DNA sequence: TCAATATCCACCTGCAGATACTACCAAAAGTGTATTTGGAAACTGCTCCATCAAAAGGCATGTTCAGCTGGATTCCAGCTGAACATGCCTTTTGATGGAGCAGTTTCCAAATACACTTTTGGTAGTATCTGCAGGTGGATATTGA
DNA sequence: TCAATATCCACCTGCAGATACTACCAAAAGTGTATTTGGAAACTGCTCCATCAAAAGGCATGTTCAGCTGGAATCCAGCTGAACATGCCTTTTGATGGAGCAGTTTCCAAATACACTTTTGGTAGTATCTGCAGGTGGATATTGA
């Protein structure tokens, strides 16, 4: 594979504690369980990741697979990031939402990378890597979004890279069955705490 | 006059290349060796690199203008920069 | 823009004048840029090795100083 | 009392050019070649461990020193060879 | 019983390299895999030079290597010359070059 | 009762000893090596500072800056030889123009 | 946690030029100067002891290294100063 | 001609070009000015090493310096060429 | 263009120095095994200092001109190379002693460890004070005449 | 040479950003006292190789001449610098992260010591064989014709 995705996957895997590497790998499912059994998880981390990277090289891994891995990693390590809330008002199936969001971003910006993954409670996790009309995207400064289709609420992570927030909000508002969006008075590092109060307000207005 | 500008620029010590262009170039070069990763750069590292580069270029220009005069000229040619690098090693 | 055309004619003229040069040919502005690019490539390659060895994502001044010292160039004012 | 690298140079030569000999003046040059590169690599490896406050020289220090000293494709192949050697040393 | 050069698959000595690293005041401790790596590197470089030199010898229609051949090899190669640019080979001469 | 005082020095003899011990220069270090080396370092330091202060005086100033160090070094035949592969930050160049 | 040579440079300066100060950028240059010469001298002294199969660095190694590194009259005066320092250190 | 035959012949060879006794004599005369006036002995391989190094130095300097005659549009070697080569090298 | 003379190039012969091979050996150096120990990896976490945007004004960009310089040509006298005849200095060879190198003693100097005192680095909060920027007045060289 | 204009120096005032000076502290580190150990100096002896002589001839030295080249003087056209008007990119500032750096734990890999093989360096002695020099012998360009 390209030398730029090998480094991405290696750096991503070196961040994962040995106490839970196997669970993440199993969820990713890119490597078969037989290949996992082939590996030794007791020698130092560098050799383990060398072996896993060789396995990925035998197959053909694309930036989509690595993006899926990064999404899965953040599902477990939510607290690493600060999470902000957005609200949508004045208002499609999941596939239409996916296509509209992706096409909006691809029209505004020539070079991007988008990915989705489903989750319980009708949730969808989104990862966006921002680019420009001249330059490639940055895979190490992404933007993560958690949107619950049966609700007008959307939660966002604080990137060290602005200049794309209004476009993101517009894409969320258009791809879904809404036409406006605002920011709520809630922000913290604990996504579940925001979630609980937000749906408490949603169910009990 | 060239004579006033030479005298003024030899009394001075400040850097002559602007910062942001040099920073952009040095970050563009770095990303090729890091395999796509955008490394961070301390502020005191870019100044070091700039000082070194400007010194290198000034001394090279001196050595080359030594070779323009050897040939009976007043005007600096690339012909003269190439040969100085060969002789220096 | 190509990020090396940001090294302008006046800057090169100033470096030349500080070097004592009276006149300059119009073909000196592209030659100098290549020289500078080569120098920077050589220094930065070694600087990045020193910091990736240490398992960092941040280039410090000591890495640059070590690289230059390897290349045969010793710089004092930094630490 | 005196020691050298001539035995191993002769083996390598018979391994790449089986029909070809080597004179005594030349093997002195080769012995000097081997002693010089050793010193350079070990010197760089000494500093990297000092810069980073380490008391042990490992294969990683040697690898980094190889990358710093050797130019281009030559470093690439040297790294490959050393990595294979360590790999099959450990697996025995 | 068994040596370490054989485990590694080498001709160069892994014990002697270990000894020289320990006796050279390079650091307090020395790992197990450093001598293996270094011996492999040295073997690779020796083989490269000897290959080029044997080729040069054959071109001149000789069966034996002499310093002239090593000099030709080194200066005809764009990388070995850069590694060995501050080095003078005894009884090696110069490359023919007019103009 | 300090070692620098016994020797008549301002530079540190104990620190030099510690740095020689920790630098992997040899398995042992004697007792006169640190004092000898500290004295040499002090001599060179003062030799540079004298010329730098003189250059500052010529420029009508009471505070030394890297320009003065550069002038001192490059106008002295021996210090330039010692420090000829060195570039000094914020030092500039010596004035030099020449007729054709 | 960080250590330097600034105290002693300031003393020497007040000893040669009592009316004269020094800026912070310049003392960095002087600290870099002191660290460089130390490394050179100690490096040469390390080799002389290795060449001659000695396990100890003494004042004789430093003296020889000074002669090798420093040019001309500067080495002469440095040798004089170091010899005096050792002489009056021993006599206490 | 005669210059081209000689150049071709000499670049093809490896042997030393200065005679041995004169070089020995000069080196010993230089050594005696150090040593505080006493005559040191010399191994033979030492003098050969010194001679090889010296001839290499001179040949390489002549090479670097004949590049400055052609730069100036000349064919004849002058001393200013050697001086400038030494200056630019840093010696 | 012709071609003898160098000159080149190839090819064969002989032999002398230097290579490669075999045997002995012995020592010193590397390997295996078991024990203990300490350095470094793995995981947390917190504060610093790096990165990203924005607003504007100062330096760079573009066009024209004319004066200066680079480059080619001609001519002539100085200086280099080539050839030839001498002979002086280098090269090669061999008896000789001075200095390097190994082995044995011992003794002086360095490492190890514990207690105790001193010094240096960093922060808080000052207080100067040196040097730079702007303003104004006096004095000369060079531009063109 | 006259001369106005920059330009050159010099002096002055103002101020603010940076250097010296105190306090203080407390952590790290250096010093002093005993004790043990081993590295290097001092002495003797031996044999290797480096200085010092004397013949032989091959390369260096000196003179002269012919021709090649360096250097100076013309001349012409290309091209670089200077000046002016304009606008775009760099500099400065403020706001957040995210990555470096310090802390704790533990476990795995390194030092240490002892007993046992093995490998490499050196020495006779053997022989053999590669390449250098010589000479034959075929065949090409070359500067004088």
Shape of chain C: elongated
Q: Main β-sheet of chain D, in a few words?
A: none
Q: Say what the CATH topology of chain C is.
A: Histone, subunit A
Q: What is the name of the CATH topology of chain D?
A: Histone, subunit A
The CATH architecture term of chain C is Orthogonal Bundle
What is the succession of H and E elements of chain C? HEHEHE
Q: How many whole angstroms does the radius of gyration of chain D measure? A: 16 Å
Can you tell me the overall shape of chain D?
globular
- Portion of residues in beta strands of chain C equals 5-15%
Count the helices of chain D. How many? 4
CATH superfamily of chain D: Histone, subunit A
Discrete helix count of chain C: 3
Number of strands of chain D: 2
Structural class of chain C: mainly alpha
Distance between the termini of chain C: 34 Å
Helix content of chain D: over 70%
First-to-last CA distance of chain D: 33 Å
SSE topology string of chain D: HEHEHH
Q: What is the CATH level 1 assignment of chain D?
A: Mainly Alpha
**Radius of gyration of chain C using CA atoms only:** 16 Å
PDB class: dna binding protein/dna
Keywords: centromere, kinetochore, DNA BINDING PROTEIN-DNA complex
Entry title: CryoEM structure of CENP-N promoted nucleosome stacks with CENP-A and palindromic alpha satellite DNA sequence
Chain A: Centromere protein N
């Amino acid at each position: 594979m390209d030398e730029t995705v090998a480094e991405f996957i290696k750096r991503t895997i070196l961040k994962i504690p040995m106490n839970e590497l196997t669970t993440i790998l199993k969820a990713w499912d890119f490597l078969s369980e037989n290949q996992l059994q082939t590996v030794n998880f007791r020698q130092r981390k560098e050799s383990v990741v060398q072996h896993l990277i060789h396995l990925c090289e035998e197959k053909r891994a694309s930036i989509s697979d690595a993006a899926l891995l990064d999404i899965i990693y953040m599902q477990f390590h939510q607290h690493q990031k600060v999470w902000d809330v957005f609200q949508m008002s004045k208002g499609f199936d999941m596939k239409q939402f996916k296509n509209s969001f992706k096409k909006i971003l691809q029209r505004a910006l020539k070079n991007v990378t988008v990915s989705f993954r489903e989750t319980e409670e009708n949730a969808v996790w989104i990862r966006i890597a921002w680019g420009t009309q001249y330059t490639k995207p940055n895979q190490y400064k992404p933007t993560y979004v958690v949107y619950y289709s049966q609700t007008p609420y959307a939660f966002t992570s604080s990137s060290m890279l602005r200049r794309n927030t209004p476009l993101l909000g517009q894409a969320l508002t258009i791809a879904s069955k809404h036409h406006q969006i605002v920011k709520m008075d809630l922000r913290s590092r604990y996504l579940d705490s925001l979630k609980a109060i937000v749906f408490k307000q949603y169910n009990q207005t | 006059g060239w004579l006033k500008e030479i005298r003024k620029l030899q009394k001075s010590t400040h850097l002559l290349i602007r910062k942001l262009p040099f920073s952009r170039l040095a970050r563009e070069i770095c990303v090729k060796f890091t395999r796509g990763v955008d490394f961070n750069w301390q502020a005191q590292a870019l100044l070091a690199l700039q000082e070194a580069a400007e010194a290198f270029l000034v001394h090279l220009f001196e050595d080359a203008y030594l070779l323009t005069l050897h040939a009976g000229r007043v005007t600096l040619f690339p012909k003269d920069v190439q040969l100085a690098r060969r002789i220096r090693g | 823009r190509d990020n090396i055309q940001g090294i302008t004619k006046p800057a090169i003229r100033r470096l030349a004048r500080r070097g004592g040069v009276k006149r300059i040919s119009g073909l000196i502005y592209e030659e100098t840029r290549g020289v500078l690019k080569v120098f920077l490539e050589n220094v930065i390659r070694d600087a990045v090795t020193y910091t990736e060895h240490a398992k960092r994502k941040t280039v410090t001044a000591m890495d640059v100083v070590y690289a230059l010292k390897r290349q045969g160039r010793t710089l004092y004012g930094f630490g | 009392r005196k020691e050298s690298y001539s035995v191993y140079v002769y083996k390598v030569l018979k391994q790449v050019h089986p029909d070809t000999g080597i004179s005594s003046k030349a093997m002195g040059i080769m012995n000097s070649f081997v002693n010089d590169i050793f010193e350079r690599i070990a010197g760089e490896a000494s500093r990297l461990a000092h810069y980073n406050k380490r008391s042990t020289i490992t294969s990683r220090e040697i690898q980094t020193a190889v990358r710093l000293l050797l130019p281009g494709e030559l470093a690439k192949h040297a790294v490959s060879e050393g990595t294979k050697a360590v790999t099959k040393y450990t697996s025995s | 019983a068994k040596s370490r050069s054989s485990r590694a698959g080498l001709q160069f000595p892994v014990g002697r390299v270990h000894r020289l690293l320990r006796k050279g005041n390079y650091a307090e401790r020395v790992g197990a895999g450093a001598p293996v790596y270094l011996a492999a590197v040295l073997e690779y470089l020796t083989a490269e030079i000897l290959e080029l030199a044997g080729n040069a010898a054959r071109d001149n229609k000789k069966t034996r290597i002499i310093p002239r051949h090593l000099q030709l090899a080194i200066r005809n190669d764009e990388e070995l010359n850069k590694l060995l640019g501050r080095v003078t080979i005894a009884q090696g001469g110069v490359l023919p070059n007019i103009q």
